[PDB]
RNA sequence: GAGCUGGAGAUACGCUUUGACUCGGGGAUGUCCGAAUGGGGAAACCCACCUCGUAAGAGGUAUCCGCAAGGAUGGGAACUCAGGGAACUGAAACAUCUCAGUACCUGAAGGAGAAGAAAGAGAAUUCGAUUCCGUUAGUAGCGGCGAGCGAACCCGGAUCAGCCCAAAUUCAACCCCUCAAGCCGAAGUGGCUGGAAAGCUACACCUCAGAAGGUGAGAGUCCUGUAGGCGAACGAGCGGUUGACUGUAAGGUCGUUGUUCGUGAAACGAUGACUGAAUCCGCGCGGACCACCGCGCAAGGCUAAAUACUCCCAGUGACCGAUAGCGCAUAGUACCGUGAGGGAAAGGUGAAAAGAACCCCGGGAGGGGAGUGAAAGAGAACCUGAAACCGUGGACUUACAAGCAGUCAUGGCACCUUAUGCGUGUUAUGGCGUGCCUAUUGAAGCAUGAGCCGGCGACUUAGACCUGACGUGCGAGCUUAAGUUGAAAAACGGAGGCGGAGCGAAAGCGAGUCCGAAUAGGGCGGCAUUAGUACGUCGGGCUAGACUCGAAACCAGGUGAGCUA
RNA sequence: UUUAGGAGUGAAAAGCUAACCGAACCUGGAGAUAGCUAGUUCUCCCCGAAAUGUAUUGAGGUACAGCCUCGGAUGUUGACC
RNA sequence: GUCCGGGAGUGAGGCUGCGAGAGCUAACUUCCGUAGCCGAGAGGGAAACAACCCAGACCAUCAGCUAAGGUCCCUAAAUGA
RNA sequence: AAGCGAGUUGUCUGGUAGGGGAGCGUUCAGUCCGCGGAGAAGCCAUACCGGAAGGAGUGGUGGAGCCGACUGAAGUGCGGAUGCCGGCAUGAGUAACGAUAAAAGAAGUGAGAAUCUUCUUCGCCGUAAGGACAAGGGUUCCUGGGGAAGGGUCGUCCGCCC
RNA sequence: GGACUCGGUGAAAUUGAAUUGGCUGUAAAGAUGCGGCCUACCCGUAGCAGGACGAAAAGACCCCGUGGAGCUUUACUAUA
């Protein structure tokens, strides 16, 4: 019995293998963007750090 | 008999190693505060967590049906001496002959044999291999 | 499963009711004054068969302090006596002995006294 | 079978060996109530009116459907639905929600009804009759977008069987075959401590049949089972050929319930008022619609077999032990009482009572002699029988000495289960010294819990819920469903998922990768690289009350208002 | 003798339904659930703390991190001078 | 010097030193950090008494010395200069 | 053939939530040649050893079995949860015998008699604490009979019990 | 008429345990077992309240408790 979370099942959930898991890094989109340059080429898996245990019963069984 | 031993048919074999532990039972030994008996422990069937944050926030992306994500068959030991067990229905060993959705190629380069395939594939991956290794085109669909 | 203890805890009582020495009453078969008086009994008796030297300790200091002052005698200023021989070392138990022989101290006086110069 | 009908086993009374004594099956006297129903109608109780008849008293009275008789309705512990419908909880509170259609009410029949042969599932341009679990998918979706509920795509077997509204069943002979009374069923003993010892010892016999057990000490030659097989009159019961019968006449709109779908970006069950069109290469939908395909055709049901159930009859399990286990090892006695509704506590003498004549105090209860008793420190409210409290004496100390208690400390009376100036049963007194549990920063407290005895004494139990130590299986790895065997099994078994190159919203890409005008960067096959995985006890956690208990409050049903009115 | 439960009675007190009704009792729905709080059983060898910060309709509630034990590890990087 | 992990605790302390904050520089009141201490170990000194001077232990010996504390007594230790 | 250390130096600190780790033993199960009649298991007590828990020497008594090593399983173990029942408690022999609305005695009896019985004297009620009908208890009333127990003394009185 | 002579019956609320005198002091400061000091021949019963932080339900006055119930108001809102 898992009821894996689909909602934070979206997002990053694929696993990597023997190194580091990712994330998303997530700045602020939307409007009144008309400034910032750096992070618009950084966005996808923003990995966090490591807090990464929370998010496991959001899935872990057949992807 | 009898008179100064204690066995007499082995079974006494013992071992050479273990495998069990200490084992618990929870609220034990008849001591311990143990853990917080407010809600957690008993029940409380949500994580043992926080709750459903950090989780909101990103606009979602959806596409996850099963559609297709593919395997692979490695490519590395079977263009060299294998000759004869690898068509698109005998090999099933590594769940291959299961049918339906694609196997795609994806192999390497160079190539100093070669081998036959009952292919039904024509990935842009093993474009480094797909005649150095050797067996026709036929495009399936 | 199963299992029905209600024998098997008679011994245990017993096998710490060994202390049902003369306490009071009758606080040798009790079930109460017992398992408790036995706490009771469970103190200072871990170290009380050492820490007793501080009471047996209460005796050479009125005998070894000054006996036969029809010498002079000092025991504290005088300790630096003792340990004026060439070799005094020891001290004690010979204290316990000195309970005999009154002459341990005769010719063991003037002998450290004046052993300055 | 020949003897005597259940516990105050009842003395007696009485019957025997062609049917007393117990009984197997087909029947019968069958009291008030139960549907019972003549009426009354508060179970054990009062009335009319007709048939009968020596003046007395005998045959009977109530509703529904082919209707003019009759046939039926009764009470039910778990199996399907239907009328059926809240709710404490969770989301750490909190109206959509989880519980769910669950508690309860009411209707049905068999111990089988329920879906089950169709305007169908699937999807490569396949496949037929329901359900269950096996595996998937614990995916898609759902969704105060929150916990959460959760198919179809590929899988096993029981089953892979026909027909229904307007152009088979009923009595019986025979029967593989079940049901209680019941029939036989095996094979040697002596001596001791002692209750005959099956313990010490001795030898043969019985064998497809050697599980539990009774007779004073565990017995194959004392005996009931087990292997071998039998039993009628009555009938069912799973029946096999056949005799009396005849085996082939509605989509839709708007408001919504369900379905996984909280209903909206979606057809599909159906209802509240409106539309009864199509009408055959016409018609139902593939999740709204366009185009083409796929399959099925208004129109009514039967389908046994497995899935899910557990009142009874043999047999079977690493449970309890007669406050243990259901409350019942013969009581849910009496009852608690305002009412439906709540209930005990309690077992045991040895094989067997042989539970006992005979003189005493005494009213007797209770106690003497002495047999009984192998054994009466079982003992006619009875095994062994530990304990706070409670019964007496004694070797020793003690009121003139102070602290719940303490341990040692010289003495002090006793003893010497080893003269060995050494110890056993101890005390005036000395250092001083404040208890335990245990929610406490915190005390030694007056902070609280505690008179004691006997037990109950809880994070575990099923769950591929998961991660991880060790031992092992394998390096190309490991299996579910039960089908065959069947007092173990088991190989057979790729339903199947996890490991697996990855990244990417994904598409798709690719051993390399999202950026776009792209040697500079985060992850990856990669890699000075484990590519592993299954079983078990086990670190935390998880789906559940599942660590238990202590709350007034919300509900369905039902009970009297003789309490105040 | 009907009235009854979320109604009746009622001289209103917010009195009563059977010795407590701020909405009867009993069988039944779930143990109301519980961060409250009592407790959670035989005897142990070596190691070891927070009331500090960030979070909170959040406070003696709870999350995590410095803070403990253990498997692996860090081939010169330690702190003192 | 050097991280990954199975699992904690229970968040609400006290005091002397170091300085302020509300403050008749008052309060084992209250906020803060910094060493120690008691929440997890006993004593001498301190009359006995959590942070104060000295000192934190393997069980047993009526064996020795150091620091504090004392050198008149009730219970140690020169009314020695 | 499951890993073990003296010789030695620091650590061996004391430890509250915790980590790695050993066991005493009872019930279920394996192997039972078995252990017990001189009688074990039930229990009462004696200075051997053990890290503690506990294992040991013997009788006592008791009456029929019982545990063992290698092993897994089990509702495996606080006296202590103001718990619950069962029993012993102590408040302690005191307060109290009930509405304070008088009684003495002769004598029957016998086990002694103060409260029975045959009875002369006293007094309280007598719109009562009379008798019948109403509900109720169902066995009250009698021929009477016995103390185990009850009537909160007890008793040769009951409407206890036959 | 109860408190005292005598015959029988004698329970409950409660509670760790009494070689159960006091000061002044000390202690989370309301100490009798602690400090230091003084003091009593031990016991029985009548009687009395200062005494154990007297007893009973774990204050129910209050606060904390993302407790309940109850009533009202145009509180958000269902609804005959």
Same mark, same amino acid.
């Given at each position: 019995?898992?009821?894996? @979370? ?9 696993? @990597?293998? @023997?190194? $580091? ?6 700045? $602020?989109?939307?409007?009144? @963007? ?19 245990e929370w998010a496991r019963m959001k899935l872990m069984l057949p992807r | 008999?009898? !008179? ?45 967590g926080r709750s459903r944050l950090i989780a909101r926030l990103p606009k ?12 692979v068959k490695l490519s590395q030991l079977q263009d060299l001496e294998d ?6 229905? !005998? ?13 795609? +190629? +994806? ?31 036929? +495009?399936?669909? | ?19 049902? %020495? ?10 109460? &004054? ?5 706490? &009771? ?5 871990? *170290?009380?068969?050492? /820490? %007793? ?11 070894? /302090?000054?006996? #036969? *002052?029809?010498?002079?005698? &000092?025991?504290?200023?005088?300790? &630096?006596?003792?340990?004026?021989? /060439? ?26 006294? /004046? #052993?300055?110069?």
């Amino acid at each position: 019995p898992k009821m894996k @979370t689909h909602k934070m099942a979206k997002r990053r959930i694929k696993i @990597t293998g @023997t190194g $580091k898991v990712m994330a998303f890094k997530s700045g $602020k989109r939307h409007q009144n @963007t008309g400034k910032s340059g750096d992070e618009i080429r950084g966005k996808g898996k923003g990995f966090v750090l490591a807090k990464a245990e929370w998010a496991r019963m959001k899935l872990m069984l057949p992807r | 008999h009898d !008179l100064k031993p204690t066995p007499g048919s082995r079974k006494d074999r013992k071992r050479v190693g273990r495998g069990p532990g200490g084992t618990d039972k929870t609220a034990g030994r008849g001591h311990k505060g143990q853990k917080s008996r407010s809600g957690a422990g008993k029940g409380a069937f949500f994580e043992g967590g926080r709750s459903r944050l950090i989780a909101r926030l990103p606009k979602r992306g959806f596409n996850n049906v099963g559609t297709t994500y593919e395997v692979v068959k490695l490519s590395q030991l079977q263009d060299l001496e294998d000759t004869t067990f690898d068509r698109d229905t !005998l090999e099933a060993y590594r769940l291959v002959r299961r049918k339906n959705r694609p196997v795609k +190629l +994806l192999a390497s380069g160079e190539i100093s044999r070669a081998v036959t395939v009952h292919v039904d594939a024509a990935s842009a991956a093993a474009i480094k291999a797909v005649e150095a290794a050797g067996g026709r085109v036929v +495009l399936p669909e | 499963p199963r299992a029905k203890t209600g024998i098997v805890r008679r011994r245990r009582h017993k096998k710490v009711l060994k202390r049902a %020495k003369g306490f009071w009453g009758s606080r040798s078969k009790q079930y109460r &004054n017992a398992f408790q008086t036995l706490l &009771n009994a469970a103190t200072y008796e871990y *170290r009380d068969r050492r /820490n %007793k030297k501080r009471d047996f300790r209460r005796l050479w200091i009125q005998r070894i /302090n000054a006996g #036969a *002052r029809l010498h002079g005698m &000092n025991y504290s200023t005088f300790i &630096n006596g003792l340990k004026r021989a /060439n070799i005094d070392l020891n001290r004690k138990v010979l204290a316990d002995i000195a309970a005999r022989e009154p002459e341990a101290f005769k010719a063991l006086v003037d002998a450290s006294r /004046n #052993a300055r110069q």
